Amino acid sequence: RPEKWVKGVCRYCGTGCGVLVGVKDGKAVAIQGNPNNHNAGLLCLKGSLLIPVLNSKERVTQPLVRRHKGGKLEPVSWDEALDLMASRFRSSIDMYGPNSVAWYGSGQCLTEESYVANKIFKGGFGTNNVDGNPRLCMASAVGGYVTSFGKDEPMGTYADIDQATCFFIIGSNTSEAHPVLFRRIARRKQVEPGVKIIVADPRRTNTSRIADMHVAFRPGTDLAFMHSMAWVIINEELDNPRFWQRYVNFMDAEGKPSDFEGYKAFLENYRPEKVAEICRVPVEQIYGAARAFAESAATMSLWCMGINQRVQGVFANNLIHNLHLITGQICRPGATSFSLTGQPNACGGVRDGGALSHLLPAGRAIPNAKHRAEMEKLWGLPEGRIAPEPGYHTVALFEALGRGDVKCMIICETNPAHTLPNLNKVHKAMSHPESFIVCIEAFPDAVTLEYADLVLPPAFWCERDGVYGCGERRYSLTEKAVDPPGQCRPTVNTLVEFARRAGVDPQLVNFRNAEDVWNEWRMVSKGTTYDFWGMTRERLRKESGLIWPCPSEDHPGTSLRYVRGQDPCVPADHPDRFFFYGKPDGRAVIWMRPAKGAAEEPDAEYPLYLTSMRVIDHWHTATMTGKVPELQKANPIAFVEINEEDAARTGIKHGDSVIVETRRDAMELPARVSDVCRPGLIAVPFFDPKKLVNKLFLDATDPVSREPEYKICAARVRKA
Ligand SMILES: Nc1nc2c(c(=O)[nH]1)N[C@H]1C(S)=C(S)[C@@H](COP(=O)(O)OP(=O)(O)OC[C@H]3O[C@@H](n4cnc5c(=O)[nH]c(N)nc54)[C@H](O)[C@@H]3O)O[C@H]1N2
Ligand SMILES: Nc1nc2c(c(=O)[nH]1)N[C@H]1C(S)=C(S)[C@@H](COP(=O)(O)OP(=O)(O)OC[C@H]3O[C@@H](n4cnc5c(=O)[nH]c(N)nc54)[C@H](O)[C@@H]3O)O[C@H]1N2
Ligand code: SF4
Ligand SMILES: [Mo]
Numbered sequence: 001r002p003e004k005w006v007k008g009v010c011r012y013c014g015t016g017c018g019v020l021v022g023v024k025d026g027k028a029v030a031i032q033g034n035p036n037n038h039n040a041g042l043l044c045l046k047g048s049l050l051i052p053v054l055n056s057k058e059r060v061t062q063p064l065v066r067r068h069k070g071g072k073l074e075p076v077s078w079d080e081a082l083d084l085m086a087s088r089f090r091s092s093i094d095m096y097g098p099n100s101v102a103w104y105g106s107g108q109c110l111t112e113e114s115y116v117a118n119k120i121f122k123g124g125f126g127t128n129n130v131d132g133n134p135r136l137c138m139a140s141a142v143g144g145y146v147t148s149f150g151k152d153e154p155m156g157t158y159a160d161i162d163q164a165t166c167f168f169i170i171g172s173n174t175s176e177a178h179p180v181l182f183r184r185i186a187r188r189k190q191v192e193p194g195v196k197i198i199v200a201d202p203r204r205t206n207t208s209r210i211a212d213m214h215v216a217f218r219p220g221t222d223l224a225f226m227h228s229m230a231w232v233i234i235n236e237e238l239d240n241p242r243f244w245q246r247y248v249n250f251m252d253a254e255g256k257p258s259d260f261e262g263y264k265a266f267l268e269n270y271r272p273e274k275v276a277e278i279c280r281v282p283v284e285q286i287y288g289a290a291r292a293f294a295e296s297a298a299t300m301s302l303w304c305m306g307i308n309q310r311v312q313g314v315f316a317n318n319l320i321h322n323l324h325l326i327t328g329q330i331c332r333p334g335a336t337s338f339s340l341t342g343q344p345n346a347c348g349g350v351r352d353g354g355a356l357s358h359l360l361p362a363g364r365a366i367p368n369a370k371h372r373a374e375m376e377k378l379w380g381l382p383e384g385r386i387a388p389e390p391g392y393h394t395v396a397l398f399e400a401l402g403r404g405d406v407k408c409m410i411i412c413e414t415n416p417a418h419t420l421p422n423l424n425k426v427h428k429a430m431s432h433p434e435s436f437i438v439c440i441e442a443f444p445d446a447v448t449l450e451y452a453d454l455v456l457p458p459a460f461w462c463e464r465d466g467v468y469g470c471g472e473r474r475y476s477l478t479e480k481a482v483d484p485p486g487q488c489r490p491t492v493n494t495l496v497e498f499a500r501r502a503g504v505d506p507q508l509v510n511f512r513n514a515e516d517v518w519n520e521w522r523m524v525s526k527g528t529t530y531d532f533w534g535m536t537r538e539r540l541r542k543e544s545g546l547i548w549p550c551p552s553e554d555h556p557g558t559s560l561r562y563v564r565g566q567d568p569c570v571p572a573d574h575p576d577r578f579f580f581y582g583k584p585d586g587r588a589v590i591w592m593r594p595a596k597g598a599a600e601e602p603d604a605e606y607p608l609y610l611t612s613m614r615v616i617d618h619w620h621t622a623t624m625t626g627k628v629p630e631l632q633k634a635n636p637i638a639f640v641e642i643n644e645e646d647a648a649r650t651g652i653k654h655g656d657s658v659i660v661e662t663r664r665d666a667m668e669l670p671a672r673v674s675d676v677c678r679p680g681l682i683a684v685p686f687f688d689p690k691k692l693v694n695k696l697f698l699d700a701t702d703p704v705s706r707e708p709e710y711k712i713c714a715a716r717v718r719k720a
Helices: 051-055 078-096 111-125 139-149 158-162 179-191 206-210 222-235 241-247 260-270 272-279 284-295 313-327 346-352 369-379 394-403 423-429 491-501 514-525 537-542 644-650
Strands: 004-009 018-024 027-033 101-105 130-132 166-170 196-200 213-215 248-251 299-303 336-339 408-412 436-440 454-456 466-469 474-478 588-591 608-613 640-643 657-662 665-674 681-685 713-719
Touching: 027 051, 078 101, 078 408, 078 436, 078 454, 078 491, 101 111, 101 394, 111 130, 111 346, 111 369, 111 408, 111 466, 111 491, 111 514, 130 394, 139 313, 139 336, 139 588, 158 179, 166 179, 166 284, 166 313, 179 206, 196 206, 196 284, 213 284, 222 260, 222 272, 222 284, 222 313, 241 248, 241 260, 241 313, 248 260, 272 284, 284 299, 284 313, 299 313, 313 336, 313 588, 346 466, 369 514, 394 423, 466 514, 474 537, 514 537, 640 644, 640 657, 644 665
Parallel strands: 004 474, 101 130, 101 408, 166 196, 166 299, 196 213, 248 588, 299 336, 408 436, 436 454, 608 681, 640 665
Antiparallel strands: 004 018, 018 027, 466 474, 608 713, 640 681, 657 665, 657 713
């Protein structure tokens, strides 16, 4: 029975459900959904079972040090820990230059933590070595959005779900990975039964059980599938010339200006009969998916890691946007190209705040000299303080750590020893005997702590205040509901003290609380097309999220970007009803991206596709959801999914232990036989620390976004 209800945000998925925390003064006792946030008071099982996680005593509550490598982690005071951290970082810079140090962060960090980490490093130390886990996740979608539209982030919101009359859901297990949203998608098809749902995924998941059509294409061939859809759309005159002639540009396979006829000529390469064999699907599915897509009153695509975790990730994102653009299924209620964000805070913390190695806050870029000056001005730095070279992107960061080039690294609210691709390579990198690794980590079973030289105990979740920005441009405050336990401190406060102690100019880190940093971030955003000056803490305390752009206390926020009358970045006096202002002529761009494959495709010797996936009960590495007994009752440990008519024809039964092996490692797993994986595909989950699947996975990255291709590599299976 609670006395106080404290408003915040679910700690887990990018659906970003508002949460109310019931405290019986000082202890959280109950949790409900925020009736006033988009989720309308609905929480999924994970969300609803957060109170045990918050209450867990299995927490990191004092700072810890590992005197020597391979030693034992032992207690140390906060002051010795802060001096040790600051002296090491200063010493490294002094001897070897800013690029010898790095920040490795998280879309789970509060927007304020990431904003301070990013400033200390980019403006304080003078290094652009600030990256994070959204690199493993959302970087393809950023590239797809910037190359297609000139600006990052969806142009619609979740509310478009209520109006789509077709959902094309590709690379997304919405029901297991975005359960609230999937229910809203289910809800919509309930209310209007003439709503069509296409689910495109090599796996037949719970998500397909509301689909009119499930396209179970061969991993990696979805680019061809989607070009092929565009061919049908053009061929059957289902396209929208009034839209694309005014609003669209066309870039050929080399990225040179082209035209509709160019596009038609290129698409001839993607005829349905030919592309149907590549994809291993009945040709009727291409015609079906295309016609549904184009004939529908309002079409919405939603996609996640099956599209992004790919060496052609940016290109795939482009291809989804091509369909919306050729058909004009965009900038109207129900009709948009909506990339789904995994993490609660990839959008606000890392992407919008520019906390990646090539980026600067609010739409600005490292290589852009005017943007550096804009930031040196706002942040009060000398000229040239901000380096012109992008720092290390994640994969290359950990390679630099391994070579000795990065000597000191902070890891904050991520578990990279468990979740980075090609683990054997990374664990060797993380074991460099002369490296100094500092972990800010709340739960001591995180495997990465086994490589840490120093561990700082942070406040978790609603033990402190701060903003999370979910996938629909929604910035939502979590207020503080409880004191942190033991010696846990807000990471914002820890970062300021680290900076001060490490000789950073104190005017650069002039913040007492997360609120202070928010007002600066508001200021740094003002005038950009990411503007949220209008999101004062006061408004964020009272409201259940605001959606940007929101440039004044009287502005309600923005649902439809790029749309005159809706989006304030679009002049009221603009000639055309739409304005894609991230492109100099106001036109979104269809990209004629050639369709290729995975970087490690199957062959005689490794004849299987290996994928990796999300499972509903388990959040990533299970340091949180693992503290909840009910979350263990269904899938307690790792398994490997195997296709029925692949199992029998190769002589493998259900339940039998098997060896999944790839060029990089081998691993015994309990087989799980179903019709989930289409023939020629197996799939492993990644929440079991006793089964570090990322040891089998390769490391190739999209050459633009530098996202790893976790979704595809080549494997073999044999009976144990
Ligand atoms: N329960 C739970 N929910 C979560 C998370 C969690 O750990 N647990 N994490 C959150 C985060 S950070 C993220 S990023 C999201 C991720 O959520 P999703 O991306 O929706 O979930 P995944 O299983 O990673 O998604 C992969 C889907 O893409 C498919 N796929 C495989 N190969 C291909 C291909 O070649 N083409 C296409 N088009 N699809 C393919 C897989 O079969 C799989 O079903 O979920 C979020 N929500
Ligand atoms: N094979 C394979 N690997 C993948 C993926 C895949 O699809 N396949 N998906 C990738 C994607 S999309 C993502 S998003 C990444 C995510 O990968 P990670 O970010 O490595 O996984 P998480 O379990 O979210 O790690 C968050 C950590 O933060 C700690 N923590 C919780 N609260 C606090 C706090 O207040 N402060 C601090 N300091 N720490 C805290 C938790 O204990 C946990 O260890 O995984 C990637 N890895
Ligand atoms: S759908 Fe995501 S944000 Fe909503 S309660 Fe479930 S885990 Fe939390
Ligand atoms: Mo993610």
